[PDB]
Amino acid sequence: PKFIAVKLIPKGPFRDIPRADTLFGAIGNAISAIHGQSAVEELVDAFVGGARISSAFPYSGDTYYLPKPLSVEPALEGILRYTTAKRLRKAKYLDLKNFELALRLRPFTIPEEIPYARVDVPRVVLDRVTQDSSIYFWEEIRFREKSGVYFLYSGPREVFDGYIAPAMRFLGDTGIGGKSTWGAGLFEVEFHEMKIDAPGSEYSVTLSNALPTKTPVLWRLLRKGGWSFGRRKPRMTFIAEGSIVKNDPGGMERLELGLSHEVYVYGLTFPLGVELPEG
Amino acid sequence: EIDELTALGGLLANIGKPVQRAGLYSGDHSTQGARFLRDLAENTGRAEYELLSLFSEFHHKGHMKNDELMIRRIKELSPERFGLTMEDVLNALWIVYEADNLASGERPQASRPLYSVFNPGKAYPWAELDFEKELPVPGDVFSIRSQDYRELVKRLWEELSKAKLRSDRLLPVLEKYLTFVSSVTSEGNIISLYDHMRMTSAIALAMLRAGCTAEDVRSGRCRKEKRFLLIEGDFSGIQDFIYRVSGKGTLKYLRARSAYLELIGWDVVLEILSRLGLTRANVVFNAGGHFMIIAQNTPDAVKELEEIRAKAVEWLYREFESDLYLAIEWEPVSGREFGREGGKNLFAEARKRLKHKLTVRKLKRFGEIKGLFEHGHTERLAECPVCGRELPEGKLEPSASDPETKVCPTCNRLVSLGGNLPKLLGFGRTAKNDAGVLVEGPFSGFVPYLQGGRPVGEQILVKNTLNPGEIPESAQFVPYFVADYFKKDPKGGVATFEELSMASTGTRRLGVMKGDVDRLGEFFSSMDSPSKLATASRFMDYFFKGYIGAIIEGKFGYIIGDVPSLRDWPEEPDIVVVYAGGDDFFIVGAWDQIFELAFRVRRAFNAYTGGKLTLSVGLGYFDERTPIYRMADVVSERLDTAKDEGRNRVFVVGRSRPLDGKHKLSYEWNHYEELWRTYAPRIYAGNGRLKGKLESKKGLLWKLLEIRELYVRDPNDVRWAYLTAYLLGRHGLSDLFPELVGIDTKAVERKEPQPVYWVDGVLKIVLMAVRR
Amino acid sequence: RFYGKIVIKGKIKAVTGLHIGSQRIANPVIKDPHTGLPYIPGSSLKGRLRSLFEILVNSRLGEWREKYPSLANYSPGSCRPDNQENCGKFFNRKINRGWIHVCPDYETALACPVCRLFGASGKESNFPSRIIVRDAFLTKEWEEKWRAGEAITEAKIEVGIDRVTSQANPRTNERVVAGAEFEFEIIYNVENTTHWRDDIKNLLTAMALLEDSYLGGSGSRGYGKVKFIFDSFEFRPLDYYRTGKDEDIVSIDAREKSVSDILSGFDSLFSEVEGKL
Ligand SMILES: [Zn+2]
Ligand SMILES: [Zn+2]
């Protein structure tokens, strides 16, 4: 399990931490520009076979953060004081050192500070003749000086360098969603290698949106829907990152939406092994 | 019937204790309650009062001797007047006997009152309920004079004569008077007399359903066998449900949601009670989207509880797109599992077996659906502009504000309910396909019982009063309390966001506070019997339900004292209690009275509890033009700022801090209320104006908050020490702020903030109360 | 489709101190939520280049009916006096109360010289923007003067004076300290090679107007005078994004001013682009 980490060093403030499906729709819309139409459907067949990506997760000066599994909650009492049993459960992200410990059900530590800060900036709308104001709020993720966001890739490198590494240079100059005409989703890219040790067992946490075919073991549910070319997507029941499946490959559902091409929604799981308690 | 006669048999058993502490007859209150129920059957009485004297007479085991005394007395008495069998009336005596021991636990001295559930050293002076003109503060112990117990009985003599002899009608009478009466006179008894008679009735109704007979109760088989079944549920997703609405529906709509959630909370609990054959005594508590019912362990009931749960959740999936979930779990216990055995608390670890089944079920958030992860693309859905639910087109109907927007159908029922809140006296639980129902629950429909109107339905929820005023004789009376203060507008209605802040002190702003009791889940594990937990979850319940109304009405100056207050409390304050659950509250209002209220709630809470539990209030200040889903988002994060630090501390103002970690933001409660005593009466006089000769120097207090901004870029610099001294010199104000002109060598060695760090929040409240 | 991305970089020189504000010193400038350095939003610079280019077209709604179609469907002026969307007049989008020019569909927005570049939503169409106005932050020379003890904001107290009795009514305004340097970045997208030319002529025209007008704030009391110093023109072709092999067309404008770049250097510096398109 040596993962090609893709670091996204932000320029302007992101609209959100990109979900896994925000990325794959961004990547597919890149390859429809820098590779034409037929290479995107070829890209979709590559992720069906072996290739998997993950959701984006923050990083703070090489200290790579990762989602906390839901494997720790049913037996957090078997780990370890009541104040510690809540602040460890309330958390959302764990460090790369501490994500490996909770896969083996070891005692561990939460991070102290979160890198990003969801701030809300007020903007205004002005008519051109009378300069009369019309306020509306707006809110976006604002990252710190060193920090940023990354995500993972595991698969054949001839699919990486052929597809993703072009797309993450085209997506450095048009954003990953949000009001990317205000310089929101823009970044610069550097690639790395990253290693997470997984204990061999039949249960697995998913580092991306699961969208399962069979019912998982323990799952934090998530409802979101996208926007392809001005067309609303229906709300789908993805699972959030860090839920536990047993031998589930996930899936992608093509959607109609009245476009010239079919539109796929990435929900392929990203399994890393986990040790579950009794239930 | 034979069912209900055992239900009142446990409920009316320990009566005789309130006639014992007077001394109308001799001792042995089982002999007293036999005479107290015999003479009530004489005048203005039914026939059961002679027969319900049997239950009070033969408990405590001094009266069932050789199983032989019980028969000859009731050989003369006639059970055929209602059709009771000679042995089946003997059966109900044993069942009340065992339930009289199970709710009690391991257990006369003199006449000690109700010792308080938070400090068992202190006690309650005896008082009535209804939360009006009285705050029961646990004070010094005073054994009650026996002359007081005479007028208690005569008032109870009259109230038992009027009320229908029925299980749901004696409960609001016994809760009215015997709430503050101790059951067993002992050292630090914190078990009330209402609850000890209520759980005695609650268990006896389950022992009848479990299927035990008289000699099985006599044998040791009925205890130490799995026959009881602790149902417990919880709503997970309340704060993500009420507050996630956009900039529509200002405060008539949020106040409608928070009572809509309580309807669903009762529409499930009352569904469990009817389907299992249980009364309202079998509810241990129900507050804040979390209940607990004691029930029987049959194979028959567990078939029913899976039907209740699967029908609730599939309602909560279509009507709300997985925003709210009702996780119901049960666990079979034995009889011995209630009381403490040895030194080990069996009831806590039996509650940990049940709370863990909650924690797993909150993870598998929608498991019993089977169309959950199924995908079917339906043509052309759209979403609501108010609440953001996705509906198919055509179901979106025009609103009650503008015909331009196309809101949910379930929002127009909550705007119309948003106007019917002052014109309201309760709800009526009735069938789904009825006329006049605003809102539907997971099992039934709720008709509004207005100001002028007649109640309709088979069960009638009645808000904030325990007396069946205009209720028919056939109906069931289910009283629920709710924190319900609201400032009325010039009309007869609920205030707006944009009314409260125009009528505020100083500048205009909306003052949201959201605070909650800390370490409360560790507190309810201290209890070790169903008598003890039903009390502690009810006295904690009535603070945020009833006694928070009397604080906002402006009372109890002896208990509270003086708070950090910009102006003295008005007659009709402009405060809108959105939600207040029992562990939690969320109150909006005029932003310089919410500031005054938070120190007025905390002060009264610290004397309601005997100094043992604390609040953590997270104050925010937001403009009227602000969507509520952001106001609850920022304030709850200002809550968890004041929660993870010390759990006894108030957030006051958004304040800048160094990146070291030594400087924590939110003020300790006692530490802040001396910063008001020093800083405020020397720079502020009251009612939004400043002290003498400090006017035309409001530029100064901004400059004094500029020097605080030099402490934040560099904490190590001592540039703030002389700039403090000089700016007070040039303006001639050398007398003000002596704590800030000099460094504190005591504060350096303690590694605590300097006194220029604390001055930000105490200056801004004085500054924002002036127009600034 | 996609051809390449003309990335403009350079420096913004706020010659006279400018103010933006957050509405929360009574009118504080916007800063970062962490470091506290002030900046220019991308929206306060896209919309300001939109207002100034909107008015110029508003005068020339007649003369540009042969160069651009979909201006024959407009007459100059607002639509405030009758609350009627897409009427005969030009500013036909009421956002909350402000009436802004936004074209309603695609095939009229493709010809309209504002909505083609700056972008327009409308109903059923949503023609996206073509420029990407990235934010502007202080130059590392000025990020270091932030660390060198200098104050980067300063309060100006203006007053309001009674005409007869000459009373004083002050107020405060936190501005950015005059003389500062912001480094900007404007990333055009080459969608169509037919009207490749005019969008760079119509963007630099809006900067000729922004250099004479103000950039937000009080402005007419003096708080604008933003000045553009260009440093790099690029092209970033479609060959570049496929492989990453650095063969992008670069035009040197290291000492070129924004009126010395429109025609003084526009045939000159973008001569190398026109062979590649
Ligand atoms: Zn709705
Ligand atoms: Zn246009």
JSON list of N, CA, C and O in Angstrom, two decimals, chain B residues 256-268:
[
{"chain": "B", "resi": 256, "resn": "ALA", "atom": "N", "xyz": [-42.32, 27.08, 15.91]},
{"chain": "B", "resi": 256, "resn": "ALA", "atom": "CA", "xyz": [-43.21, 26.01, 15.50]},
{"chain": "B", "resi": 256, "resn": "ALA", "atom": "C", "xyz": [-42.52, 24.67, 15.38]},
{"chain": "B", "resi": 256, "resn": "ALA", "atom": "O", "xyz": [-43.14, 23.65, 15.69]},
{"chain": "B", "resi": 257, "resn": "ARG", "atom": "N", "xyz": [-41.26, 24.64, 14.94]},
{"chain": "B", "resi": 257, "resn": "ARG", "atom": "CA", "xyz": [-40.53, 23.38, 14.80]},
{"chain": "B", "resi": 257, "resn": "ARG", "atom": "C", "xyz": [-40.27, 22.74, 16.14]},
{"chain": "B", "resi": 257, "resn": "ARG", "atom": "O", "xyz": [-40.43, 21.52, 16.29]},
{"chain": "B", "resi": 258, "resn": "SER", "atom": "N", "xyz": [-39.88, 23.54, 17.12]},
{"chain": "B", "resi": 258, "resn": "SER", "atom": "CA", "xyz": [-39.44, 23.02, 18.41]},
{"chain": "B", "resi": 258, "resn": "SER", "atom": "C", "xyz": [-40.60, 22.42, 19.20]},
{"chain": "B", "resi": 258, "resn": "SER", "atom": "O", "xyz": [-40.38, 21.62, 20.11]},
{"chain": "B", "resi": 259, "resn": "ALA", "atom": "N", "xyz": [-41.83, 22.82, 18.88]},
{"chain": "B", "resi": 259, "resn": "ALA", "atom": "CA", "xyz": [-42.98, 22.14, 19.45]},
{"chain": "B", "resi": 259, "resn": "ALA", "atom": "C", "xyz": [-43.47, 21.03, 18.54]},
{"chain": "B", "resi": 259, "resn": "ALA", "atom": "O", "xyz": [-44.19, 20.13, 18.98]},
{"chain": "B", "resi": 260, "resn": "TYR", "atom": "N", "xyz": [-43.10, 21.08, 17.26]},
{"chain": "B", "resi": 260, "resn": "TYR", "atom": "CA", "xyz": [-43.42, 19.97, 16.38]},
{"chain": "B", "resi": 260, "resn": "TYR", "atom": "C", "xyz": [-42.58, 18.76, 16.71]},
{"chain": "B", "resi": 260, "resn": "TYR", "atom": "O", "xyz": [-43.02, 17.62, 16.54]},
{"chain": "B", "resi": 261, "resn": "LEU", "atom": "N", "xyz": [-41.37, 18.99, 17.20]},
{"chain": "B", "resi": 261, "resn": "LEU", "atom": "CA", "xyz": [-40.52, 17.88, 17.60]},
{"chain": "B", "resi": 261, "resn": "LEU", "atom": "C", "xyz": [-41.04, 17.22, 18.86]},
{"chain": "B", "resi": 261, "resn": "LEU", "atom": "O", "xyz": [-40.90, 16.01, 19.04]},
{"chain": "B", "resi": 262, "resn": "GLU", "atom": "N", "xyz": [-41.68, 17.99, 19.73]},
{"chain": "B", "resi": 262, "resn": "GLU", "atom": "CA", "xyz": [-42.21, 17.42, 20.96]},
{"chain": "B", "resi": 262, "resn": "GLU", "atom": "C", "xyz": [-43.48, 16.63, 20.69]},
{"chain": "B", "resi": 262, "resn": "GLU", "atom": "O", "xyz": [-43.84, 15.75, 21.47]},
{"chain": "B", "resi": 263, "resn": "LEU", "atom": "N", "xyz": [-44.17, 16.94, 19.59]},
{"chain": "B", "resi": 263, "resn": "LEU", "atom": "CA", "xyz": [-45.34, 16.15, 19.22]},
{"chain": "B", "resi": 263, "resn": "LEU", "atom": "C", "xyz": [-44.93, 14.76, 18.78]},
{"chain": "B", "resi": 263, "resn": "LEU", "atom": "O", "xyz": [-45.56, 13.77, 19.15]},
{"chain": "B", "resi": 264, "resn": "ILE", "atom": "N", "xyz": [-43.85, 14.67, 18.00]},
{"chain": "B", "resi": 264, "resn": "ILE", "atom": "CA", "xyz": [-43.33, 13.38, 17.55]},
{"chain": "B", "resi": 264, "resn": "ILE", "atom": "C", "xyz": [-42.75, 12.61, 18.72]},
{"chain": "B", "resi": 264, "resn": "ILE", "atom": "O", "xyz": [-42.80, 11.38, 18.77]},
{"chain": "B", "resi": 265, "resn": "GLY", "atom": "N", "xyz": [-42.23, 13.33, 19.71]},
{"chain": "B", "resi": 265, "resn": "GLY", "atom": "CA", "xyz": [-41.72, 12.68, 20.90]},
{"chain": "B", "resi": 265, "resn": "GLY", "atom": "C", "xyz": [-42.81, 12.06, 21.74]},
{"chain": "B", "resi": 265, "resn": "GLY", "atom": "O", "xyz": [-42.59, 11.06, 22.42]},
{"chain": "B", "resi": 266, "resn": "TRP", "atom": "N", "xyz": [-44.01, 12.64, 21.71]},
{"chain": "B", "resi": 266, "resn": "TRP", "atom": "CA", "xyz": [-45.12, 12.07, 22.45]},
{"chain": "B", "resi": 266, "resn": "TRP", "atom": "C", "xyz": [-45.94, 11.12, 21.59]},
{"chain": "B", "resi": 266, "resn": "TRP", "atom": "O", "xyz": [-46.68, 10.29, 22.11]},
{"chain": "B", "resi": 267, "resn": "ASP", "atom": "N", "xyz": [-45.83, 11.23, 20.27]},
{"chain": "B", "resi": 267, "resn": "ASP", "atom": "CA", "xyz": [-46.65, 10.39, 19.41]},
{"chain": "B", "resi": 267, "resn": "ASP", "atom": "C", "xyz": [-46.07, 8.98, 19.35]},
{"chain": "B", "resi": 267, "resn": "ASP", "atom": "O", "xyz": [-46.73, 8.04, 18.88]},
{"chain": "B", "resi": 268, "resn": "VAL", "atom": "N", "xyz": [-44.84, 8.81, 19.81]},
{"chain": "B", "resi": 268, "resn": "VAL", "atom": "CA", "xyz": [-44.25, 7.48, 19.87]},
{"chain": "B", "resi": 268, "resn": "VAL", "atom": "C", "xyz": [-44.42, 6.88, 21.26]},
{"chain": "B", "resi": 268, "resn": "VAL", "atom": "O", "xyz": [-44.75, 5.70, 21.40]}
]
